[PDB]
Amino acid sequence: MEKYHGLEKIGEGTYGVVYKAQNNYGETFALKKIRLEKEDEGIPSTTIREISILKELKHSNIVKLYDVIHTKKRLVLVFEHLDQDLKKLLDVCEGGLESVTAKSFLLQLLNGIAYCHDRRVLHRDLKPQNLLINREGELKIADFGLARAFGIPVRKYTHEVVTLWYRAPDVLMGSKKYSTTIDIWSVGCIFAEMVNGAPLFPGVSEADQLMRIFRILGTPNSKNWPNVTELPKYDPNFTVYEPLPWESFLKGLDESGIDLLSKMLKLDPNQRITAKQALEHAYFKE
């Protein structure tokens, strides 16, 4: 294909396997084989087009897309290559990341998200595994925009489970709206995880996920979430929980850090801080 050789499996993304490869310039790339919704139904032309426009996303914290290779029921995406990801790093660490590093990862993640959100490009699947990191501690987000083009599939058991951990309450309760707020919730979860060394809400199912959330942040109500009642899977019979003190589940974060984090994990999507507002927070000036 396109003259690439030396493939080498290097992981398994949410849409297929990822390989490290080289072209005929010696230069390295990451090749993602897209395994999609209906594989036997071919790849619609609108999909090809939607993906190819993602080539305009050019920013220091977004994994660059170089080429879209479409061959007889075989879609391959050629991406910038990075040798490490945040999940792998969190896995080996005990107690999380040092504050200075957490901050730098947080800053760079926000910058990437902000650049995309300004162009109406959503992720809808942010998680540690999609945050790629190079030698120099630079962070690049992978997979922005693929959910819109490919749709979000129900992944292999072990993957769907990890995915729940970063899913906003409104989404778990049946919302299907287009929103930038979905990504900000994921950042909050990622933020908490860098400080604690473990996922903040590790549920095993949607329902379990929602309860783990409410058990820590409080159950929704008229004051904290007007119109939550409009969500399809909302239930007024939710066992009531009062919110826990931020300090109790955020290991000596820091004052400004807790505040910023509290703005990300607002249950009401409409009150959730944006990426660009987050970048203005005193946390990053300290």
Overall CATH class of domain 84-286: mainly alpha
Q: Which residues are annotated as a binding site?
A: 10-18, 32
In angstroms, the CA 31 to CA 5 distance is 11
Overall CATH class of domain 1-83: alpha beta
Resolution (A): 2.2
Start-end of CATH 1.10.510.10 domains in the chain? 84-286
Which experiment gave this structure?
X-ray
Query: Crossing angle, helix 255-264 and helix 181-196, to 10 degrees?
Result: 140
For residue 121, report the phi and psi dihedrals to the nearest 5 degrees: -105, 125
Task: Using alpha carbons, select from 208, 209, 227, 219 the residue that is nearest to residue 269.
Answer: 227
Residue with tokens 């929704």: 220
Q: Which residues are catalytic?
A: 125
Start-end of CATH 3.30.200.20 domains in the chain? 1-83
In angstroms, the CA 145 to CA 233 distance is 26
Q: Which residues are annotated as a binding site for ATP?
A: 10-18, 32
